[PDB]
Amino acid sequence: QQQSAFKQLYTELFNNEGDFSKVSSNLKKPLKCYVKESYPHFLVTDGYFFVAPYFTKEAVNEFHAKFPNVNIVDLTDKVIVINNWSLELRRVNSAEVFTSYANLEARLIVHSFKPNLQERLNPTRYPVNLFRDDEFKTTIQHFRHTALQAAINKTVKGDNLVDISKVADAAGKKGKVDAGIVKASASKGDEFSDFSFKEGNTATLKIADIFVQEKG
Amino acid sequence: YEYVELAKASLTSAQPQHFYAVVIDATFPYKTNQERYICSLKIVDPTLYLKQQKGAGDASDYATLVLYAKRFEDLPIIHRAGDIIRVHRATLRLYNGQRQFNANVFYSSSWALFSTDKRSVTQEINNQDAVSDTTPFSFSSKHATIEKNEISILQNLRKWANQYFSSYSVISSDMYTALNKAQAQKGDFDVVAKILQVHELDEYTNELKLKDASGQVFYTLSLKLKFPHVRTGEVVRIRSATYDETSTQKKVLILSHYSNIITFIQSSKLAKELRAKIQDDHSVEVASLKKNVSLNAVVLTEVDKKHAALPSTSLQDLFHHADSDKELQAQDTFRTQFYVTKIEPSDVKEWVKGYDRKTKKSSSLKGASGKGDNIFQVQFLVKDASTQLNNNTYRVLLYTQDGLGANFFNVKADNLHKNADARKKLEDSAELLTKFNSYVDAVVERRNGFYLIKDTKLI
DNA sequence: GGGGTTTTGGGG
DNA sequence: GGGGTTTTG
DNA sequence: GGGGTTTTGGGG
Ligand SMILES: [Cl-]
Ligand code: NA
Ligand code: NA
Ligand code: NA
Ligand code: NA
């Protein structure tokens, strides 16, 4: 039994081709999570790991409406309750986005969240980047391995085996190793991208804009 | 500079004192605030190294050193226990019963590290020789000066360090928790285990498969850059680890930015005993083979003992630089690790073809023995950590016509169209090799632009 | 006082 | 000091 | 000059 709500959600999402409709219903209940940081990075924890929530323009406006005396960029150490949220997969540059791995990210789309101002939360372990956890990383790798394997088995055909004569009696034979490279798929660029999941799309707000909106 | 022994240093003077000591434990230099970096380490010497032995239980006695600085680079990185350190202008005080030396490097204090063994960890990893037996392999500030009178101190302390590490445990039982009890700890704890496997999870991370004296097997993520000295078969002490309650598929240890992985000097009695006591474990592997999906990596092969000392080469170098890098060009035999994505030909029954040694041609045995000697002509389409993101898969061959890799499958070549026993084993092996988290550690020989597997068998 | 530096006598 | 940062592996 | 440090204004 997974004790990390975030780890279980995000894992099932990946284990279900990024289909948020296939993830267990008994997991789509409100999320009461402690706010670790609010700026420059808004990070919340589920008592074990921390993830970066993505607020829709609607979510912030609503918030700002029901809570005028509350600034989101100042919610650090404070707790919030995400009542309406969703999960979707997005291709990102992990070299820049630390809340991701292997150019893949599972995003927590926030639609409605209430700030339970001044609610002391129970003492927990030090929150770690879910996307740096061994198992999760392994789960993501499984995801890519499955996608890669399916791609190659559909791209590589005809048993084009190196003619045995090339490796046998290679006394007066020289070759270039790049002659062993094979395209894993029909991908356009140099980075594998033949995935089946349909990359989720949803307008989200940059944490910087919400900073200006509350203090130009 | 006058050097005083740990147990004799003054507690009252409160004046800067200097000393030479052995480091038996140390945290990784860590940032505390927007301007401070700390590094705590336990030190011992001829006057302080063991507790009143009678009811002490041979528990190691020690002093603690806390170096403060404004920059990470100004603090010492201890990869190995047993090495020596020289400090200048430190203040000694009593902190909860024990002698604590404090030195503000950011002001006027300085440190220097000396290798107790012939080479420092870094020099071992880089196969370099030490400038001399009086040259610090690491030190604070821009300069370090060793006076003639110091030579004796350093030499004697090195001699002492070995006697001490070969005679005692140095890292006594009270200095770490048994992995099979790790789940009972409230917070972080220390570990002392053997590195059974070093799996290259990705570009910047290693995943150590540790097993201690208790027999429990745990995994942990060790950054390559931070701890470049991890080597399978060696015994290490982990400073500050926590039990990961969120890992359900496998026992995991979480490390912090201040956690450290330390090895022991060649003379370490502890390390020696553990290297021999703790024996490789494959339970996790075997068990994981019954699961459609294993979140645990299983190295399916093993190279001939004569290669266990051969360094590995990433596919990236093997197929993208082997023809341009001076070093890679001089070699014809390499050791590498990868995971098989696809095996060719598809039909396992065609893995063994008939070979005509005179015409240099192979052929299907679906027509029977009329094709010559039986040989394996399998073509593996691999990939690894170094090429994980690119849109490529690389071919690694197993053509046994000349004997190379003949016993790879532990199944002597044979007409797979007739020998059901031989066909089944290979088929099964094929499912394993292409199964997620299955990796191959093999030695290959370059030939006419291709790499052939040799001295590598399945286990 | 004493570093490293240049300020080369004097701030906080 | 037996510890909690980051131009966030 | 400016830190750390305590010398708390002044050496080399
Ligand atoms: Cl060649
Ligand atoms: Na001056
Ligand atoms: Na001065
Ligand atoms: Na001064
Ligand atoms: Na002063």
XYZ file of C-alpha atoms (C1' of nucleotides) and ligand atoms in Angstrom:
713
model
C 0.000 0.000 0.000
C 1.468 3.290 -1.252
C 1.574 5.935 1.463
C 2.451 8.727 -0.951
C -0.758 10.001 -2.571
C 1.346 11.814 -5.166
C 3.508 8.781 -5.937
C 0.483 6.527 -6.431
C -1.434 9.011 -8.588
C 1.478 9.896 -10.835
C 2.540 6.258 -11.078
C -0.870 4.969 -12.168
C -1.060 7.782 -14.674
C 2.159 6.593 -16.308
C 1.185 2.936 -16.001
C -1.992 3.846 -17.897
C -0.484 5.565 -20.954
C -1.091 8.986 -19.437
C -4.843 8.436 -19.553
C -6.308 10.263 -16.563
C -9.708 8.636 -17.154
C -8.290 5.186 -16.586
C -6.726 6.027 -13.235
C -8.586 4.713 -10.181
C -11.666 6.774 -9.326
C -11.045 6.285 -5.611
C -8.021 8.526 -6.103
C -9.658 11.586 -7.587
C -10.712 12.960 -4.196
C -9.653 16.400 -2.873
C -5.940 16.735 -2.097
C -4.918 18.277 1.227
C -1.248 19.148 0.816
C 1.358 21.247 2.642
C 2.958 24.060 0.687
C 6.756 23.641 0.756
C 7.574 26.615 -1.410
C 5.601 29.299 -3.245
C 8.281 31.243 -5.111
C 10.201 31.148 -7.365
C 8.814 27.590 -7.511
C 5.451 26.592 -6.083
C 5.970 23.133 -4.588
C 3.538 21.117 -2.477
C 4.110 17.858 -0.576
C 1.935 14.898 0.292
C 4.025 14.125 3.304
C 6.603 12.258 1.325
C 7.280 13.933 -2.026
C 6.862 17.367 -3.554
C 5.348 18.199 -6.928
C 4.809 21.411 -8.878
C 1.099 22.231 -9.278
C -0.015 24.069 -12.388
C -2.789 26.606 -11.814
C -5.212 27.496 -14.585
C -6.014 31.178 -15.039
C -9.509 30.287 -13.782
C -8.113 28.744 -10.608
C -6.170 31.888 -9.633
C -9.009 34.268 -10.405
C -11.408 32.162 -8.358
C -8.927 32.020 -5.499
C -8.260 35.772 -5.597
C -12.033 36.229 -5.486
C -12.873 34.000 -2.519
C -9.700 35.065 -0.721
C -8.775 38.734 -1.341
C -6.722 38.853 1.824
C -4.529 36.014 0.585
C -1.536 36.099 -1.796
C -0.642 32.796 -3.455
C 3.029 33.676 -3.762
C 3.075 33.965 0.045
C 1.552 30.558 0.858
C 4.873 29.014 1.940
C 4.661 26.873 5.046
C 0.898 27.236 4.682
C -1.478 24.402 3.711
C -3.890 24.330 0.736
C -6.686 22.071 -0.415
C -7.035 21.274 -4.111
C -10.704 20.378 -4.650
C -10.774 20.310 -8.428
C -7.683 18.933 -10.184
C -6.568 16.746 -13.099
C -3.425 14.966 -14.365
C -1.835 14.998 -17.823
C 1.456 14.050 -19.490
C 3.675 16.578 -21.234
C 6.927 16.368 -23.169
C 9.468 18.689 -21.579
C 13.171 19.390 -21.483
C 14.230 17.683 -18.259
C 17.560 19.437 -18.503
C 15.663 22.611 -17.627
C 12.537 21.352 -15.827
C 13.647 19.709 -12.582
C 10.135 18.490 -11.942
C 10.434 15.978 -14.731
C 12.496 13.029 -15.948
C 13.655 11.672 -19.306
C 11.906 14.553 -21.090
C 8.558 13.545 -19.624
C 6.389 15.186 -17.024
C 3.157 14.353 -15.253
C 1.417 17.671 -14.443
C -1.039 18.393 -11.640
C -3.598 20.718 -13.160
C -5.230 22.802 -10.431
C -8.699 24.232 -11.044
C -9.844 25.074 -7.509
C -7.858 25.273 -4.285
C -8.778 26.653 -0.837
C -6.050 27.993 1.486
C -6.667 26.580 4.981
C -4.815 29.532 6.551
C -3.077 28.727 9.820
C -3.680 24.940 9.905
C -0.663 23.277 11.473
C 0.195 20.038 9.705
C 1.665 16.853 11.228
C 5.499 16.472 11.243
C 6.691 14.454 8.230
C 9.907 13.334 6.539
C 11.903 15.722 4.329
C 9.987 16.032 1.004
C 11.901 14.839 -2.047
C 11.447 15.486 -5.770
C 9.135 12.725 -6.901
C 10.967 12.733 -10.211
C 14.210 11.811 -8.459
C 12.813 8.791 -6.623
C 14.291 5.435 -7.643
C 11.064 3.461 -8.200
C 9.279 6.344 -9.965
C 12.225 6.944 -12.233
C 12.121 3.192 -12.939
C 8.412 3.413 -13.661
C 9.045 6.188 -16.146
C 11.805 4.148 -17.701
C 9.372 1.257 -18.084
C 7.058 3.622 -19.868
C 9.734 4.619 -22.424
C 11.017 1.066 -22.752
C 7.565 -0.126 -23.731
C 7.107 2.729 -26.192
C 10.627 2.260 -27.628
C 10.282 -1.503 -28.004
C 6.926 -1.198 -29.749
C 8.391 1.427 -32.041
C 11.467 -0.625 -32.984
C 9.476 -3.814 -33.564
C 7.363 -1.861 -36.016
C 10.282 -0.004 -37.617
C 12.951 -2.750 -37.788
C 11.958 -5.575 -40.125
C 13.413 -7.996 -42.655
C 16.062 -9.509 -40.367
C 18.760 -7.436 -42.037
C 21.585 -9.354 -40.335
C 25.190 -8.331 -40.846
C 26.525 -10.764 -43.439
C 28.693 -13.280 -41.544
C 31.437 -12.907 -44.156
C 32.056 -9.348 -42.923
C 32.997 -10.468 -39.389
C 34.637 -13.710 -40.542
C 37.953 -13.353 -42.328
C 38.182 -9.640 -41.430
C 41.989 -9.658 -41.751
C 42.021 -7.204 -44.619
C 38.696 -5.640 -43.716
C 38.212 -2.282 -41.982
C 34.891 -0.638 -41.177
C 33.216 2.237 -39.368
C 31.304 1.391 -36.186
C 28.490 3.786 -37.067
C 27.574 1.003 -39.481
C 25.899 -0.576 -36.466
C 23.526 2.252 -35.768
C 19.817 1.751 -36.530
C 16.851 4.145 -36.416
C 14.462 3.130 -33.635
C 11.541 4.764 -35.386
C 10.322 7.168 -38.010
C 10.867 10.054 -35.593
C 11.507 13.397 -37.259
C 14.450 14.555 -35.183
C 17.293 12.824 -33.404
C 15.324 12.282 -30.168
C 12.951 9.325 -29.865
C 9.370 10.547 -29.747
C 7.187 7.776 -31.113
C 4.744 7.680 -28.145
C 1.070 6.717 -28.286
C -0.310 8.747 -25.405
C -1.854 11.994 -26.612
C 0.136 14.810 -25.033
C -2.244 16.709 -22.784
C -2.835 20.375 -23.616
C -4.066 23.035 -21.193
C -3.278 26.730 -20.782
C -1.471 27.249 -17.529
C -0.029 30.308 -15.805
C 3.653 30.981 -15.215
C 4.487 31.460 -11.545
C 6.045 34.794 -12.522
C 2.846 36.273 -13.945
C 0.977 35.531 -10.719
C 3.793 37.344 -8.917
C 3.305 40.489 -10.996
C -0.473 40.196 -10.721
C -0.038 40.524 -6.947
C 2.938 42.905 -6.851
C 3.994 44.486 -10.164
C 53.594 25.718 13.592
C 53.287 23.530 16.667
C 51.165 20.401 16.381
C 49.368 19.022 19.445
C 47.684 15.626 19.864
C 43.876 15.480 20.060
C 43.641 14.399 23.665
C 46.246 16.882 24.808
C 44.893 19.995 23.024
C 43.885 22.679 25.518
C 40.233 23.190 26.393
C 40.820 26.420 28.221
C 43.313 28.434 26.164
C 40.632 28.944 23.498
C 43.602 29.869 21.250
C 44.032 28.600 17.731
C 45.737 25.210 17.762
C 46.992 22.955 14.989
C 47.026 19.175 14.565
C 47.416 16.097 12.348
C 44.657 13.427 12.586
C 42.995 10.526 10.864
C 39.482 10.907 9.461
C 37.154 8.042 10.299
C 33.926 9.754 9.341
C 32.797 12.889 7.475
C 29.684 14.455 6.032
C 29.666 15.822 2.466
C 30.233 19.585 2.526
C 26.680 21.012 2.597
C 25.166 24.486 2.286
C 23.254 25.660 5.351
C 22.189 29.144 4.364
C 22.658 31.763 1.635
C 26.232 32.154 2.762
C 27.459 29.214 4.823
C 28.841 25.767 3.997
C 29.677 23.159 6.639
C 31.454 19.846 6.828
C 31.531 17.724 9.982
C 34.018 14.925 10.479
C 35.145 12.538 13.271
C 38.902 12.353 13.888
C 41.227 10.142 15.918
C 44.927 9.802 16.716
C 47.352 7.921 19.024
C 45.984 9.717 22.095
C 42.266 9.416 21.255
C 40.800 6.494 19.311
C 39.091 4.051 21.613
C 36.744 4.160 24.598
C 37.637 2.690 28.017
C 37.687 -0.934 26.882
C 36.179 -3.226 29.531
C 32.497 -2.447 29.265
C 33.002 -0.178 26.243
C 32.735 -3.110 23.833
C 35.693 -1.974 21.739
C 33.809 1.210 20.789
C 35.919 3.804 18.914
C 36.550 7.087 20.757
C 37.017 10.237 18.717
C 37.020 13.988 18.422
C 34.823 15.959 16.022
C 35.975 18.644 13.574
C 33.598 21.215 12.145
C 34.968 23.318 9.282
C 33.080 26.449 8.289
C 33.419 28.310 4.972
C 31.729 30.681 2.593
C 32.281 28.545 -0.512
C 31.716 24.836 -1.147
C 35.157 24.498 -2.742
C 36.799 25.619 0.465
C 35.887 22.453 2.323
C 37.374 18.911 2.120
C 35.605 16.072 0.327
C 36.336 12.836 2.124
C 35.793 9.792 -0.125
C 37.774 7.410 2.050
C 38.199 6.719 5.737
C 41.679 6.298 7.127
C 43.262 9.265 5.284
C 44.925 12.053 7.269
C 44.087 15.726 7.670
C 46.189 18.638 8.900
C 44.405 21.666 10.357
C 45.812 25.118 11.158
C 44.315 27.577 13.662
C 41.462 25.538 15.127
C 39.658 26.245 18.427
C 38.801 23.375 20.770
C 35.839 23.298 23.075
C 33.629 20.799 24.848
C 30.344 20.036 23.061
C 28.102 17.683 24.995
C 30.868 15.787 26.649
C 33.211 15.424 23.708
C 36.140 17.466 22.388
C 35.028 19.523 19.413
C 37.484 21.367 17.170
C 36.158 24.325 15.213
C 37.915 26.082 12.332
C 36.601 29.022 10.291
C 38.347 28.477 6.984
C 36.561 31.573 5.715
C 38.756 33.531 8.107
C 42.178 32.256 9.061
C 41.839 28.509 9.444
C 43.066 25.976 6.872
C 43.098 22.232 6.238
C 45.050 19.754 4.156
C 44.508 16.084 3.298
C 47.150 13.432 3.085
C 46.791 9.994 1.523
C 47.487 7.171 4.009
C 47.689 4.740 1.087
C 50.005 5.124 -1.904
C 47.353 6.922 -3.889
C 44.387 9.102 -2.932
C 40.925 7.944 -3.968
C 40.978 10.474 -6.813
C 44.426 9.319 -7.897
C 43.206 5.725 -7.891
C 40.168 6.557 -9.993
C 42.421 8.434 -12.413
C 45.340 6.019 -12.202
C 47.774 8.754 -11.150
C 50.845 8.593 -8.896
C 51.265 10.868 -5.873
C 53.673 13.747 -6.307
C 55.385 12.468 -3.168
C 54.619 11.066 0.270
C 54.490 14.571 1.705
C 52.193 16.159 -0.911
C 48.598 16.953 0.165
C 46.187 15.623 -2.380
C 43.754 18.367 -1.339
C 44.030 21.510 0.730
C 42.292 24.820 1.512
C 43.466 28.255 0.291
C 45.841 28.647 -2.664
C 48.988 27.340 -0.972
C 50.114 24.730 1.553
C 53.555 24.416 3.129
C 55.045 21.320 4.732
C 58.058 21.902 7.009
C 60.884 19.347 7.348
C 59.875 18.676 10.949
C 56.376 17.645 9.805
C 57.656 14.772 7.696
C 58.172 12.605 10.772
C 54.706 13.448 12.125
C 53.018 12.536 8.856
C 55.000 9.330 8.407
C 54.437 8.186 11.953
C 50.745 9.019 11.762
C 50.463 7.004 8.565
C 52.111 4.067 10.256
C 49.743 4.463 13.186
C 46.695 4.804 10.950
C 47.362 1.406 9.392
C 48.033 -0.368 12.692
C 44.802 1.128 13.974
C 42.708 0.215 10.901
C 44.125 -3.269 10.689
C 43.760 -3.966 14.410
C 40.364 -2.447 15.143
C 37.083 -1.791 13.377
C 37.427 1.988 13.664
C 33.754 2.081 12.683
C 32.353 0.140 15.612
C 28.877 -1.413 15.807
C 27.547 1.613 17.660
C 28.385 3.734 14.638
C 25.766 2.313 12.262
C 22.450 0.437 12.021
C 21.815 -3.003 10.532
C 19.985 -2.750 7.206
C 17.523 -5.327 8.407
C 16.552 -2.961 11.220
C 16.581 0.236 9.199
C 12.791 0.381 9.187
C 12.736 0.691 12.963
C 14.717 3.901 13.061
C 12.985 7.212 13.864
C 15.206 9.328 11.606
C 18.432 8.978 9.633
C 21.047 6.373 10.428
C 24.434 5.137 9.206
C 25.210 1.962 7.197
C 28.189 -0.262 6.477
C 27.645 -2.604 3.534
C 29.215 -4.201 0.491
C 28.535 -2.876 -2.984
C 27.141 -5.863 -4.827
C 26.193 -3.921 -7.964
C 26.546 -0.460 -9.487
C 23.790 0.098 -11.978
C 23.978 3.186 -14.259
C 20.359 4.305 -13.963
C 20.936 7.335 -16.135
C 23.245 10.067 -17.358
C 24.038 11.395 -13.875
C 22.851 8.747 -11.458
C 24.129 5.384 -10.169
C 21.998 2.913 -8.235
C 24.008 0.956 -5.664
C 22.849 -2.550 -4.646
C 24.109 -2.798 -1.108
C 24.181 -5.757 1.234
C 25.542 -5.599 4.796
C 26.457 -8.107 7.442
C 22.815 -8.663 8.314
C 22.139 -10.014 4.865
C 19.480 -7.451 3.861
C 19.696 -5.991 0.387
C 18.972 -2.320 -0.164
C 19.262 0.041 -3.100
C 20.195 3.708 -3.128
C 20.835 6.464 -5.684
C 24.424 7.667 -5.770
C 25.173 10.584 -8.123
C 28.124 9.875 -10.415
C 29.734 13.268 -9.986
C 29.395 13.313 -6.179
C 30.578 9.800 -5.451
C 32.798 8.677 -8.346
C 34.614 6.150 -6.224
C 31.904 3.505 -5.904
C 33.135 0.111 -7.094
C 31.343 -3.223 -7.043
C 32.878 -5.605 -4.496
C 34.183 -2.861 -2.172
C 32.851 -2.132 1.320
C 31.581 1.375 2.124
C 30.133 3.273 5.075
C 27.143 5.484 4.341
C 26.799 8.539 6.582
C 23.225 9.608 7.136
C 20.607 7.587 5.338
C 16.846 7.233 5.830
C 14.440 4.323 5.214
C 12.124 5.013 2.275
C 8.598 4.093 3.238
C 7.298 4.941 -0.231
C 9.300 2.258 -2.010
C 7.134 -0.823 -2.225
C 8.843 -2.860 -4.943
C 12.290 -2.750 -3.369
C 14.084 -1.702 -0.206
C 15.470 1.817 -0.717
C 17.773 4.122 1.284
C 17.348 7.903 0.779
C 20.460 10.084 0.934
C 20.596 13.807 1.712
C 22.717 16.581 0.341
C 24.928 16.168 3.354
C 25.043 12.344 3.249
C 28.324 10.718 2.345
C 29.652 7.401 0.998
C 33.093 6.493 2.369
C 35.435 3.625 1.566
C 38.202 2.289 3.782
C 41.976 2.351 3.499
C 43.558 -0.889 2.238
C 44.458 -1.883 5.810
C 40.924 -1.731 7.186
C 40.226 -4.911 9.113
C 36.521 -4.180 8.913
C 36.431 -3.797 5.179
C 38.542 -6.845 4.655
C 36.246 -9.039 6.744
C 33.113 -7.717 5.166
C 34.411 -8.117 1.648
C 34.865 -11.789 2.398
C 31.856 -12.310 4.622
C 29.061 -10.662 2.628
C 28.358 -12.710 -0.480
C 26.557 -11.727 -3.640
C 22.802 -12.152 -3.578
C 20.528 -12.907 -6.539
C 17.284 -13.570 -4.669
C 15.799 -10.235 -5.813
C 16.704 -11.046 -9.417
C 15.339 -14.578 -9.360
C 12.181 -13.404 -7.700
C 11.749 -10.557 -10.136
C 11.874 -12.912 -13.057
C 8.413 -14.240 -12.042
C 6.899 -10.785 -12.348
C 5.687 -9.488 -15.709
C 7.297 -6.195 -14.735
C 10.278 -5.820 -12.446
C 11.148 -2.442 -10.942
C 14.532 -4.025 -10.125
C 17.340 -4.198 -12.627
C 18.669 -7.692 -13.325
C 22.119 -8.055 -14.915
C 21.596 -11.230 -16.974
C 25.253 -11.901 -17.788
C 28.783 -12.102 -16.430
C 32.122 -11.626 -18.180
C 35.133 -13.925 -17.866
C 37.066 -13.311 -14.669
C 40.039 -12.115 -16.730
C 37.981 -9.100 -17.725
C 36.515 -8.171 -14.335
C 39.233 -5.556 -14.202
C 38.471 -4.152 -17.640
C 36.800 -0.709 -17.611
C 33.393 -0.267 -19.261
C 32.676 1.829 -22.357
C 29.342 3.424 -23.096
C 27.506 2.686 -26.313
C 27.752 6.414 -26.995
C 31.522 6.127 -27.249
C 31.374 2.670 -28.796
C 29.337 3.741 -31.807
C 29.755 7.520 -32.088
C 33.386 8.131 -31.155
C 35.188 4.788 -31.548
C 36.441 6.022 -34.948
C 37.457 9.505 -33.860
C 38.734 9.187 -30.279
C 42.453 8.433 -30.077
C 41.991 6.093 -27.144
C 39.016 4.180 -28.462
C 40.884 3.648 -31.716
C 43.791 1.850 -30.095
C 41.582 -0.783 -28.496
C 39.832 -3.741 -30.137
C 38.346 -5.306 -26.986
C 35.926 -3.407 -24.740
C 33.527 -4.090 -21.869
C 30.089 -2.501 -21.878
C 26.593 -2.633 -20.429
C 23.265 -2.306 -22.216
C 19.726 -3.651 -22.479
C 18.461 -5.593 -25.482
C 15.500 -3.977 -27.234
C 15.124 -6.443 -30.093
C 16.759 -9.710 -31.174
C 17.333 -10.759 -34.775
C 16.348 -12.847 -36.527
C 12.873 -12.854 -35.090
C 12.451 -16.606 -35.328
C 14.455 -18.092 -32.465
C 14.772 -21.200 -34.594
C 17.024 -19.283 -36.973
C 19.497 -18.246 -34.310
C 21.608 -21.270 -35.217
C 22.631 -21.446 -38.874
C 24.805 -23.853 -40.800
C 28.213 -22.464 -41.646
C 30.529 -23.253 -44.564
C 34.016 -22.321 -43.397
C 35.299 -22.368 -46.969
C 32.715 -20.187 -48.710
C 32.224 -18.002 -45.624
C 28.451 -18.437 -45.921
C 25.734 -19.441 -43.505
C 22.301 -20.946 -44.203
C 19.024 -22.078 -42.622
C 18.881 -25.572 -41.220
C 15.207 -25.849 -42.021
C 16.471 -28.135 -44.760
C 18.726 -29.990 -42.283
C 22.496 -30.649 -41.769
C 23.243 -29.855 -45.464
C 24.564 -26.435 -44.482
C 27.809 -27.179 -42.611
C 28.895 -26.567 -39.024
C 26.306 -25.176 -36.639
C 26.929 -21.673 -35.306
C 25.061 -18.870 -33.598
C 24.416 -15.836 -35.761
C 22.380 -13.606 -33.458
C 22.152 -9.818 -33.867
C 21.258 -7.817 -30.788
C 19.737 -4.367 -31.101
C 20.839 -2.626 -27.901
C 20.627 0.739 -26.172
C 21.945 2.178 -22.901
C 21.995 5.064 -20.450
C 24.315 7.177 -22.627
C 22.002 6.918 -25.625
C 18.728 6.670 -23.745
C 17.227 9.777 -25.321
C 18.419 9.529 -28.960
C 16.411 7.902 -31.741
C 18.935 5.089 -32.150
C 19.410 1.437 -31.328
C 22.853 -0.161 -31.790
C 23.771 -3.596 -33.207
C 25.910 -5.908 -31.138
C 26.622 -9.285 -32.739
C 26.999 -12.808 -31.468
C 28.502 -14.684 -34.366
C 30.176 -17.781 -32.889
C 31.791 -19.187 -36.061
C 35.235 -18.459 -34.649
C 34.426 -19.331 -31.089
C 33.612 -15.883 -29.810
C 30.583 -16.014 -27.525
C 30.007 -19.709 -28.245
C 28.839 -20.377 -24.700
C 26.822 -17.203 -24.279
C 23.464 -18.914 -23.971
C 24.850 -21.894 -22.012
C 23.327 -23.839 -24.909
C 25.715 -25.416 -27.434
C 24.662 -24.481 -30.947
C 22.345 -27.010 -32.603
C 19.555 -27.399 -35.145
C 16.871 -25.389 -33.392
C 14.371 -26.866 -35.885
C 14.927 -30.296 -34.351
C 16.303 -29.990 -30.823
C 13.261 -28.865 -28.843
C 15.309 -28.643 -25.650
C 17.756 -26.228 -27.192
C 15.004 -24.200 -28.859
C 12.998 -23.735 -25.684
C 15.924 -22.526 -23.602
C 16.847 -19.922 -26.160
C 13.261 -18.810 -26.564
C 13.028 -18.294 -22.798
C 16.339 -16.452 -22.795
C 14.919 -14.228 -25.516
C 11.982 -13.153 -23.336
C 14.349 -12.233 -20.507
C 16.756 -10.220 -22.655
C 14.028 -8.094 -24.156
C 12.196 -7.715 -20.797
C 12.260 -4.289 -19.219
C 14.997 -3.721 -16.643
C 17.077 -6.592 -18.059
C 20.614 -5.514 -18.807
C 23.702 -7.205 -20.299
C 27.276 -6.742 -19.068
C 29.458 -8.052 -21.850
C 32.917 -7.885 -23.354
C 33.042 -7.183 -27.092
C 35.724 -7.262 -29.728
C 35.641 -4.804 -32.630
C 35.952 -6.328 -36.084
C 35.455 -4.701 -39.492
C 33.272 -1.970 -37.991
C 31.248 -4.322 -35.851
C 31.259 -5.488 -32.248
C 31.147 -9.207 -31.384
C 30.271 -10.528 -27.952
C 32.931 -12.724 -26.284
C 33.847 -14.063 -22.846
C 30.295 -13.332 -21.671
C 27.756 -15.875 -20.387
C 24.183 -15.765 -19.167
C 23.616 -16.500 -15.491
C 46.413 41.554 15.370
C 47.151 39.901 11.231
C 45.745 38.203 5.618
C 46.184 39.732 1.109
C 46.549 43.636 -0.841
C 47.583 48.373 -2.258
C 44.320 50.717 1.083
C 50.647 51.845 2.047
C 46.846 55.039 7.065
C 42.391 54.265 8.571
C 35.930 51.981 8.804
C 32.425 49.530 10.824
C 27.959 20.663 15.592
C 23.894 14.132 13.782
C 23.102 18.492 9.264
C 18.154 20.857 5.070
C 20.735 24.391 -0.316
C 20.032 24.930 -5.342
C 20.873 30.134 -11.172
C 17.073 22.352 -7.979
C 21.488 15.347 -10.834
C 39.288 48.591 1.294
C 36.861 45.241 3.594
C 36.052 40.152 6.784
C 36.358 38.425 10.745
C 37.074 39.708 14.884
C 37.742 42.284 18.955
C 42.435 44.757 17.617
C 37.372 48.572 18.648
C 42.760 52.410 16.103
C 46.525 51.112 13.876
C 51.720 47.179 11.369
C 54.186 45.706 7.648
Cl 37.301 -2.197 -37.968
Na 46.625 47.115 4.188
Na 44.490 46.233 7.485
Na 41.288 45.482 10.531
Na 38.965 45.158 13.454
